């Protein structure tokens, strides 16, 4: 969930 | 069409077989996902400029890229955002109807025209156009605890990622992490010992790590007699850290050969070092599997998990995989719920039919004709190119009730005729169909008319309405068709004759129930006769009830979709400006040890140096993933209660910085969110301090003077932090021998990274980056004692040129539509709606002189356009319903008898919602039910059902009066004839929607909303119509 | 306002708004936006023995953008508490400069 | 230029091919590399899949992965082609002078 | 013929050669028409530059890279107008200088001093047997026959 | 633009200009003396009459 | 082949209102298949002869 995109996770 | 098929049962069965086959072939070729795509096309640029600040990055890259984008066909608006991390993005939003692929192709073709004008570094790294839309499916996590994050990232990228891309249904896999790279950590003291410079290192590494193309022997323009050809080969690239450390920086006449290991230390590292993830405290490397359009989600999740279980046998020691979050269990649960409701509806209709009609071969016709209706609905869904998703399945669950009401109507009429007149099944079926065929056609037309407008909306809510509209309309049309073809033939061929005098002889529970229902019907018709006796009083009572219902309706909050317990909670840490990644890591460890205590949280992912509200070293965010709902069945174990407990604990214990947990909205892209998002621009480029002062003046005008709940209103950017600025005196820099190329060289080399070349690392190319050692990069004195070489080669202190100093500056920039912007937020407290609040803020911004403007943001762009489309569509639907009813009854006055039962259903639904909000505010936490999308859908459903009942009552009363009765006599006998099927349909539908009234678990928020609306609407509207519709008929026939 | 100033304002504010309307194929300004014009004199170049490439290079090398960096970067030593951005202008913005 | 079949493949063609999965309507893929430093990637879609939408989607999937490819590749560029491979005629120009 | 267990090129080549061998002598395929499709792998010339000695004798590496590239490869220098069209100017050695392996084994590179320093000392030329083609099919290494 | 409308585009341009005039500097005005849609609109009006 | 047979059966059952005469009509396909296969086989034998 890193590197600029969070993602729903 | 009914007499044709009553005499041709086999022909009817053939058409049903064709419908079944079409429905199955449609079910087998439908994409399965959690949600559809509601947001509009968006494209992004994502340039990289390492070492650049927000101002440098913005002004030299992002503005240049953006001012070439006006004219891309379909552009709605345009945004830009840069921060102090070296990365910036341009985000173009396009109007609906636009093709995402053509949009992205056009954006790339426009970017190509200006790619040359950007800095050389931005061109080295490259600009990456891409579409924002994502069809997220799953998250994979590799945790080791024994190996670094670089080794895990490399293993993932080399072994695990290229095999998940190959699985059928996967549309894209993304690895969150920086790749490997040959890192060179130069030491400036050792550099000046030998009198070298960073340029020496860069040029040497570019000159000694190069690719050689030798050529061939025996080439094409050859000499006569050449018999052999052969390609020559040479390897001029370095591959290891030893070879890189052996690079020669200076060859002396003495032959000493000083090397690159003398002044630096070379090892394999990472590209950025910015972010760092952890799962429950241990290092991890996460992937993000994303589904492809027209792909099945459950099959792809199953395949991913199986492939990972296969690959796990080659993992190094200590490593393990884990999929904490997966968005296929949602659609799987929705499908299971559809199946369970279908089965329980079958059981309920069986029980009702057997209790009332008192025979078994009556309970087999609905069981046969309902599934065929749903199959035809699936076929139509597949044809129109939709998918199977949470909303489509809710639509099926809703339409089951109407599709069972059709069959109940037909079979009850046929049985009534057969029992009353002792007719065989064929004659009884012919008579019943002659009575109800035109009414069935009119009911279908009216239902289509009332469901169409739901598909003609605009925006994201339009895409959400289209699902229900199309699914329900198709299912209802197929149900009507099956009611005119297959149900009559089934009744004619399956049902058996009733011996004359058969009933009235039952001796058991059946006789007791028959007597009881006879008495109840007698009492009911007595009460309706009383109601018809006094007309003015009941009509004024009805006007009062309708006005009270409208009142209760208008005094109802608004929303889009209620927040749902989707299993996870989001967290956002933020430390004071200027913090480092070490304090952020300590605070994140505190947050992790806190979330461990909460027994409802199972996993916790932690990301450092990144947040949705900006990306900085002093930011972070977590993802608390909760147990399965089966275990979280208690008062304080839902998502909102866990969010509250976590925020409380955070405020209690967090020493440095603060953190807040929240439950995000359902639709991540365009899902309900609250607030009047604003983007204050300045047209005249007055500056940043001036725009900030104007933003604060506007915040002040709004906070107390306005009506916006002064707590909620807030600035939405990133507070300024202290910076270190270096004025360069050019006059004094020229008094000495210092030029301006060397100043730029020294300043840009002392603190930032440098991309010099690439090298092949066991199969794949990677970057080579030079940067100073950490000990020369930490204190403000490492920049003030930076000597620069003058024209005579000697060094000169930079204090005699620059005079560095501290100052407060901006850590983030934003443009909106080409003008510097600054975000603001707010919310009208209560009693003031978004309309007049937005008018007030617009006038406020008008007060601020020219050169400052307001641009709406986010959902306020949708809310800005008036809500006239809804009123227009509803009025047109009402006119169409009136026209259809006038065509059916052959009168311009009778349709008014059926158009007067809308107030009843509206009052019922509104009163039920209000009563639930009161009962849950007195003993519960907060008003949870409002006037949202699900309220609209359930209200349209209840309105359709009530219109159907009223249509049948009125059409039965109109034919009886034609036979030679009065109006009161006709209304009385029509009520007495329709009493039983109305009771049966109500029993079935209400007991079927009851499981939605107490929904608890996955997606139970929308299920509870629709359940409340439908339950109370049906109950109240039926109880009222059963007595008022005869009165409407009587007064409409006596008035004209 | 002069016609050069009005041309600049048009290019900056009015033309982008017009060329992102639905239906506009392209907008053409009968003029040009502003620029910094250096009007060299060859006889003066000769009095000092200079060239045109001399002026070009002197301009290109003294009007550059400096991307400095930051204090306390990500690969840091244990115990670093504060970060800070470094900022140096490097560029020229007026005719007197 | 100057890359063997193996280096060319593993550095460019595999990179493109892996990303080209999931393209709507793809049937099978196939790459090929040579010692001259020139390879290709052929994507065969299903009949009934339009050539134009397929080409636009393939171009978009290629641009995203383009940033990682080597520097010499980006400099020469990756070209797209959707023409047949079997001949229709052969025109022979002949002369005696 | 695909290989899915990543067994290498030599193993797949041997398997394809045995499959071609039993496709003949089976009776269903007429021999002389069963052929391996891809272009055959042939021997190559490898140059192994010695950076240690190349530096001991005062020889750069950009110099070695310029020498090797210029001897056997055409360079595209500029454009010239030929009867109303811009066409290419191309530089390259004449045929006599790029036909044998001795023409590349006897090259010399400028020393810092300006001397010859034959490539026979700061390098080692030898014959190899490299792959002239590498094919994949559906993500796996493949070899074609017919 | 190919597939563009004249009357719609002219109306949109004039409305956007009316809106943009709020931020003009002091003394600056706008006017479209040459407009190709007035003829279309007057012709349609005459035909309808 | 199976789709063709099923379609014939269903269409005939609809038109003539029976589930039996479609059976009688579908019992005549094996004759055509035997004829076609035997014809191909016999012509192959003749040409080989
Ligand atoms: C799909 C295939 C559906 C089957 C074909 C339509 C059969 C149903 C109507 C056939 C029919 O002759 O019924 C009469 C015509 O219906 C009519 O009222 C006129 C035709 C209306 C039915 C057309 C159905 C098309 C939609 C089917 C989907 C009844 O009415 P009648 O009084 O004219 O009796 C004259 C009897 N030959
Ligand atoms: C989903 C589609 C499933 C149905 C597929 C049907 C395939 C062909 C079946 C044709 C069967 C037609 C039988 C109609 C009854 C026999 C004719 C008759 O005597 O009806 C009297 C009037 O016919 C009339 O008035 C005309 C009736 C014409 C019916 C045509 C049905 C559509 C084909
Ligand atoms: C007295 C009462 C009697 C009532 C009547 C009997 C009860 C019927 C109950 C069963 C319901 C009707 C039968 C529906 C079965 C499912 C059909 C699905 C077919 C499908 O997948 O498409 O086509 C298109 C694709 C074409 C190419 C793909 C074809 C795939 C091969 C299909 C082979 C199977 C079908 C042919 C042989 C049966
Ligand atoms: C009675 C005939 C059905 C009429 C109403 C059906 C409603 C429920 C059908 C199941 C559903 O909605 O989605 C299916 C669930 O898949 C499945 O796993 C099959 C569900 C079991 C069959 C439905 C049982 C009747 C309820 C297909 O969804 P899918 O695309 O994932 O299936 C891939 C198959 N090739
Ligand atoms: C680009 C060009 C666009 C052109 C646009 C054209 C727009 C015009 C559209 C006209 C739509 C008319 C809608 C009529 C709605 C009729 C609803 C009631 C029909 C009904 O159930 O009455 C039965 C008659 O059966 C029937 O026969 C009803 C047939 C109605 C079919 C719908 C038409 C009574 O029958 P009964 O029970 O009294 O015996
Ligand atoms: C043999 C059995 C086959 C079962 C499935 C057949 C499904 C075929 C499609 C339905 C027929 C078209 C109905 C229709 O009005 O057209 C579509 C609905 O229009 C709309 O968008 C608005 C209306 C949507 C609800 C209409 C529900 C009708 C369901 C069919 C009733 C049949 C009753 C039983 C005979 C528009 O599609 P398009 O042409 O504009 O574009 C093509 C996109 N792929
Ligand atoms: C919702 C629409 C409500 C419309 C109610 C009109 C009722 C008029 C009945 C008047 C009457 O005495 O009969 O005749 C007559 O002249 C009745 C007036 C003509 C009715 C035409 C209705 C067209 C509606 C289009 C809007
Ligand atoms: C190969 C092509 C096969 C086509 C389908 C063959 C089905 C044969 C059923 C014949 C039954 C024997 C006749 C009979 O009356 O018994 O019976 C009864 O009353 C029930 C008979 C129900 C037969 C339904 C056949 C539907 C076929 C649907 C295929 C999809």
Author numbering:
A (entry chain D): 120 to 128
B (entry chain B): 1 to 1040
C (entry chain A): 147 to 243
D (entry chain C): 50 to 146
E (entry chain C): 680 to 825
F (entry chain A): 292 to 340
G (entry chain C): 874 to 922
From the study:
To further enhance the stability of ADP6, we covalently cyclized this peptide by cross-linking its N- and C-terminal cysteines to form CASP. We then incubated 2 μM the MtrDCR103-nanodisc sample with 100 μM CASP for 2 h to form the MtrDCR103-CASP complex and determined the MtrDCR103-CASP structure using single-particle cryo-EM. The reconstituted sample led to a cryo-EM map at a nominal resolution of 2.95 Å, allowing us to obtain a structural model of this pump-peptide complex. In MtrDCR103-CASP, the three MtrDCR103 protomers display the typical “access,” “binding,” and “extrusion” conformations. An extra density corresponding to the CASP molecule is observed to anchor at the distal drug binding pocket of the binding protomer. No extra densities are found in the access and extrusion protomers. It appears that a number of residues are engaged in anchoring this peptide, including those within the entrance drug binding site, F-loop, proximal drug binding site, G-loop, distal drug binding site, and hydrophobic patch. Within 4.5 Å of bound CASP, there are 19 residues participating in binding. These residues are H46, F136, I139, M141, R174, F176, S275, T277, A288, M290, Y325, F568, I605, V607, F610, F612, F623, I625, and L668. Particularly, we found that the side chains of R174 and T277 are involved in forming two hydrogen bonds with bound CASP to further secure peptide binding.
In Neisseria gonorrhoeae, the best-characterized and most clinically important multidrug efflux system is the multiple transferrable resistance (MtrCDE) tripartite efflux pump, a member of the widely distributed resistance-nodulation-cell division (RND) superfamily in Gram-negative bacteria. N. gonorrhoeae MtrD contains multidrug binding sites and a proton relay network that generates the proton motive force (PMF) essential for drug expulsion from the bacterial cell. This multidrug efflux pump couples with the MtrC periplasmic membrane fusion protein and the MtrE outer membrane channel to actively extrude antimicrobials and mediate drug resistance. Based on the cryo-EM structures of MtrDCR103-CASP, MtrDCR103-Col, and MtrDCR103-LL, we observed that MtrDCR103 employs different binding modes to anchor linear and cyclic peptides.
